[PDB]
């Protein structure tokens, strides 16, 4: 009826009648995806699921 | 276009650059490539921009 696994930012749990899964953004490592060359400020703008 | 053995959840990472003498202002001197399936590097193929 209730479970929890993970740490702050990256955590799956069941609260009340619902289930929540939180992803820490800094965990996703998007700086590392492309070299810092030719890019200074990186920011997210669109999410599809 | 990038017709390799690409599976789901895989995100190609390519960069095109031009290092010519004539310099037109930033915003368009280089581009990224993510899925490569006839990718134009833009979320829209608009020629009325």
3-state secondary structure chain B: CCCCCCCCCCCCCEEEECCCCCCCCCCCCEEEECCCCCCCCCCCCCCCC
| Closest among A19, A20, A18, A22 to A8, alpha carbons compared | A22
- Note the resolution in Å, 1 decimal: 3.9
| Residue spans of beta strands (DSSP E) within chain A | 4-7, 10-15, 18-22
A38, A41, A48: best to mutate for the B interface, most B CBs within 10 A: A38
- Residues in chain B whose beta carbon is closer than 8 A to a beta carbon of chain A? 13, 15, 17, 30, 32
């Amino acid at each position: 009826g209730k479970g929890n696994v993970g740490a702050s930012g990256n955590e799956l749990k069941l609260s009340n009648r619902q289930i929540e899964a939180s992803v820490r953004l800094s965990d996703l490592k998007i700086f590392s995806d492309y070299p810092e060359s030719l890019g200074n400020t990186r920011q997210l703008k669109q999410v599809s699921v | 276009t990038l017709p390799a053995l690409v599976g789901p959840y895989e995100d190609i990472r390519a960069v095109l650059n031009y290092g010519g003498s004539i310099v037109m202002p930033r915003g368009c001197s280089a581009i990224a490539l993510s899925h490569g399936v006839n990718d134009s590097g833009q979320f829209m193929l608009d020629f009325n921009d």
